[PDB]
Design a protein around this ligand. Structure first.
Ligand code: CL
Ligand code: NA
Ligand code: NA
Lengths: 176, 175
DNA sequence: GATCTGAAC
DNA sequence: GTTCAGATC
C-alpha cells in the first residue's frame, strides 16, 4: 500500500493522509523543553470551509506576540514553529494554505502543506506555547520592547515616516 | 497601455522600464539617509535570470541585520529588511524566476522584484543601515544577533530536539 | 539551482 | 477570503 501515487517535486507536495502518518513522530511527553511550554489553544479542522478554527485556552495569552509553538496531534509532535504575531494571526496565515492559492502560487508552500495535512488528518490539534522575554532596544533615540527583530522594527519606523513625509510607499513595496 | 493582461494582484505587474519610476521619491529626499551608506550594487544578468552583486562597502558585506533601500537612477524603488547579510537577501530575490513563479515555490515579492529589475536593466544602488543589536537571554544563555527572540528560541529548541531525538518533526524542513 | 517559513491585508 | 515578505537548503 503506497503512501501516494504521484512523483512529488518537493516535500511540501506530499500532504499527510491520516494520523498513521505520525506514528514515528516524537511524543510531546518526551519533549525536553515541555516545562517551559504551556497549552495555549487548540486548532479545529473545518474541512467544508477549508480552514482551521481556534479554541482559545490560555485566554490571557491569546493576544500576546512573539512565541515558539508546538502542534501536537494525538500526543505526537507534528511541528515546532514561531511567530512574532499572536497565535491567531499565525493561524490566519496557515488558513492561506488553500488548494486554490497553492494553484495561484500565492500562499507559502509551508502553509499549504500544514493546512492540507491538518485538514486530511482531521484531528483537533493541541498548541503548546512559550513566550520568550523581549529585550529592550534603541532605534533613532527611541526605546522599544516587542517581538520584532531590530531590522524589521527599523524598516517599519522608516516606512511609516516615509509615508508621512511623501504620502506614498515606494513602488516596490506593498506591506508596511 | 502599460500591459495588456488583467492582473489578479499587484505582484503580477512587472515594471517595464526606468520610466515606471518617474513618480518615485528621490533618494536625496529620504529623511533617514544619514543613517544609510552605499553597501553594494546589483547588476542584472538577463541571460541567467539573476542579479549579480558588486561589493562596495566591503567591510559590511557579511554584516547581518539591515534595512536596505534599492535606488535606480536616484529614485527609491523599494525599502526592505533582512536578518541575513545582503548577499543572502539577494540570493532570495534570485528565487523570483519565471519557472519558480509557475511552480508556486517563490514568493510573489521575489518574482515581482527580480523580474522588474531584470526588465528595467539598470545597475541598482543598495544603501544599508545596520541597527545595533540588543543582548537577550534564553534558557540561561545570552545572545546578541539579528534574530527575533522567538526565531532564535525556535532555532535553539529545534537543534536540541534534533540532538535528543536525532530527527526533526515531520512538519518541519528548515532549521 | 530551487525550496521553505511566516507576515500582512 | 487572499496576497505580500523574506529565510533557507
Ligand atoms: Cl523619508
Ligand atoms: Na519556523
Ligand atoms: Na519588508
Amino acid at each position: 500500500h503506497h503512501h501516494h501515487e504521484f512523483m512529488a517535486k518537493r516535500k511540501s507536495d506530499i500532504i499527510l493522509k491520516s494520523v498513521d502518518d505520525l506514528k514515528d513522530e516524537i511524543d510531546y511527553k518526551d519533549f525536553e523543553y515541555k516545562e517551559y511550554f504551556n497549552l495555549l489553544c487548540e486548532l479545529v479542522p473545518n474541512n467544508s470551509l477549508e480552514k482551521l478554527e481556534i479554541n482559545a485556552i490560555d485566554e490571557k495569552n491569546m493576544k500576546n506576540e512573539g512565541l515558539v509553538y508546538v502542534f501536537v496531534i494525538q500526543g505526537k509532535i507534528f511541528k515546532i514553529g514561531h511567530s512574532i504575531t499572536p497565535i491567531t494571526k499565525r493561524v490566519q496565515s496557515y488558513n492561506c494554505g488553500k488548494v486554490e492559492y497553492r494553484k495561484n502560487g500565492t500562499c507559502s508552500t509551508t502553509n499549504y502543506f500544514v493546512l492540507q495535512s491538518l485538514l486530511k488528518i482531521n484531528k483537533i490539534v493541541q498548541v503548546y506555547a512559550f513566550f520568550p522575554e523581549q529585550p529592550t532596544y534603541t532605534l533613532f533615540g527611541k526605546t522599544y520592547q516587542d517581538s520584532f527583530s531590530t531590522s524589521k522594527r527599523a524598516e517599519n519606523v522608516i516606512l511609516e515616516n516615509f509615508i508621512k513625509n511623501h504620502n506614498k510607499k515606494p513602488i516596490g513595496c506593498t506591506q508596511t
